[PDB]
Specification:
Chains A, B: Its EC number is 6.3.4.21. 2 copies of one chain form a homodimer. Chain A is an alpha/beta fold and 416 residues long. Chain A contains 17 helices and 11 strands. Helices cover 44% and strands 11% of the residues of chain A. In chain A, strands 5-4-9-8-7-6 form a 6-stranded parallel beta sheet. Chain A has a 5-stranded antiparallel beta sheet with strand order 2-3-1-10-11. In chain A, strand 7 (298-299), helix 14 and strand 8 (328-331) form a beta-alpha-beta unit. Chain A binds chain B through residues 77-79, 82-83, 85-87, 225, 228, and chain B through 77-79, 82-83, 85-87, 225, 228.
Amino acid sequence: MTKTDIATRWKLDPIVRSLIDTDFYKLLMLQMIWKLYPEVDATFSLINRTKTVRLAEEIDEMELREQLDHARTLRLSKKENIWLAGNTFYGRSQIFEPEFLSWLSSYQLPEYELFKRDGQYELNFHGRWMDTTLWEIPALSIINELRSRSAMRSLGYFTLDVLYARAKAKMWEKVERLRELPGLRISDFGTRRRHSFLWQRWCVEALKEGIGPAFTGTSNVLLAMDSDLEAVGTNAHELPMVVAALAQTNEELAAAPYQVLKDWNRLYGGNLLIVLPDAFGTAAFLRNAPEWVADWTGFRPDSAPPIEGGEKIIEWWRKMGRDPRTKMLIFSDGLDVDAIVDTYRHFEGRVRMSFGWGTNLTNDFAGCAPLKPISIVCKVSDANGRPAVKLSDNPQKATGDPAEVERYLKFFGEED
Amino acid sequence: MTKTDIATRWKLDPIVRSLIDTDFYKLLMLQMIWKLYPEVDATFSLINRTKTVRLAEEIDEMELREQLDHARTLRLSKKENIWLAGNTFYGRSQIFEPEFLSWLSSYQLPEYELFKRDGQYELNFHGRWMDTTLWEIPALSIINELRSRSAMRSLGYFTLDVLYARAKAKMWEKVERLRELPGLRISDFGTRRRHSFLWQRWCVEALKEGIGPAFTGTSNVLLAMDSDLEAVGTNAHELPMVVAALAQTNEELAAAPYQVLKDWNRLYGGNLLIVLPDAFGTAAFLRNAPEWVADWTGFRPDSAPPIEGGEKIIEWWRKMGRDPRTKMLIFSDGLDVDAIVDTYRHFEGRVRMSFGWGTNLTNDFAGCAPLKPISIVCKVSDANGRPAVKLSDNPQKATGDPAEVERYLKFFGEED
């Protein structure tokens, strides 16, 4: 299957298939930005947190230009356009305005800034927030599949067969474990760090085939269209990070975590009403949350330990008089299977749960060779020329301009 | 590589792809039926209008029943549903109401009656008009492709490879001839009599590459959807054949040929206003026919020769003072390249032309081998009770009860 293709790879072998070969959350955010913040500028920057061991030494610069440049030639196909307008997404129709789809029909990834620096690549995307946000996933994809490709370059047909066979076996074992929890609800979130498109596709097919109803879909829009699965995702920290950087006063900065919910609710409802509160600390978030936040459908404890984070949300729901059995907790992050089973077994019957399976699903070839990790990202660095920042539930793991981080930390505070 | 496919083809190898692997006009008609004649019953009968050549000796009955059975297993796919709702057809958006599509989303082919006799197969589909109409095409494609597989079951890799190779060269040489008339407009219309699904797909691709802009589309909606081509088609004889057999008053009958136009024009308009006169003889149709028939976009002479039938309909507009240069004639009655070329040069610049290329396009292997084609149909037999009849524009090729055939003949008359 896939082991045969790698070997068979003459022309360019494009990593990014189409403009919708990205995560669903990116499309919902894009429409919100297009509608409510079309004048805002936002820079996105690629960052290799694993300074150890270069990257400009594993990926030919020109191969990089080739893939990135190809991605810039992509356009919404006729069928993709029709599918976005007529398909049902979170049980709702027309979440995508015809006007917005029209704008998207002519959109194309914009210019980028690339340069080598200490065996590392500096990749930045400048311009209107609505023109740069879609660059994030594609860029990480191109880099990831290029590292994997380049690695397996030497490998011979036979070696590849053993490599992929052992990875399928490693993947399927995890399925047999999850298969033991029928009430489990899990979806795919591995586009961003996939070992490659084809492999992600195989993984997604193995999930639906192996746990049936327990598998609620994939966040990869192209794959959801191609195999008739539900597209999954709501929003990311990008939202709060930017609206917070747009704030000029204390009143505005304090309001920004809640202002994003208002903007989000102007376009979406129902099951899309999921709160992501850890950007500037969940404790600070819940303590200053307007009561109406308690009526949203669920929460996403993203940066804290699953159990501790979940219980914090539940305690708040009790405080507000809401029944947590009616609410949902969406765990995503990089949880491995053990985290998923222990988390599930712990909260079962007390609240609704949903799990996101990312890196650990779409990129676990660890001992499958007869190979490196790489903590790579492409977050928002600034908005309208001011530093975008993220002080998660673990302040020490903050993101962005150190001085700004300090300002936010001092402003929002941090749990003991 | 249709050859490699044939030899390498254990379980059932289904011929009918999906519910939309049919002619577009069938879906337009079906809707009209679903909205104007939902209670009327109509039977369809497969008839091999060829004494010589016994299909029972070529096609295995059990195989046939398998193909037929699998077909009624098919349902609209999630994507076909969305595509039919959001794609733009003859210039209009959502030509298919949500009500109708919700119905078709549940539809499945009814039961059939297969009887063996005198070396031939008898196939009848009973039920409501709207429940049998879709059997026509699928049935024809099943028999015809079974004929082909049956005739190639004893070939063998190389023998098959030469056969197709020469079939392709044959096709392409025809393409070469047609690209000489950059002004011709030709569309694919060979679904019911295609040598096979893959072959048709190849012929449409070659036609698209060869004459470029001269190629206007395909009547096969599945192909239209897969290749982003325009779906082509209007209405067929089964409309006036049923509104006739349903008539009772000697007056009601004489108003049958025009009642259909009144109905069709109530759901459709624009370029879909193509008159299909030969039903009970063009001349008769024209002698009467309300003034407004002359406001339609064009005619489709189906039973008379191209030139003869064309002038006949043009000399009508003339007297009706309507300018023929703004109208259209559509010649889709199984013509060959010469017929297309000869007919084109004859009417050039005098009127708008459109050619429907069927059998000769998708089933021409004449001398490509390193079985003899037959004339089979599956028209309307009866409606609610009364027998259905087709007094075409050539009494020697009528259809239905020979008795009722003479009544209609006597009621409408005859030209030559």
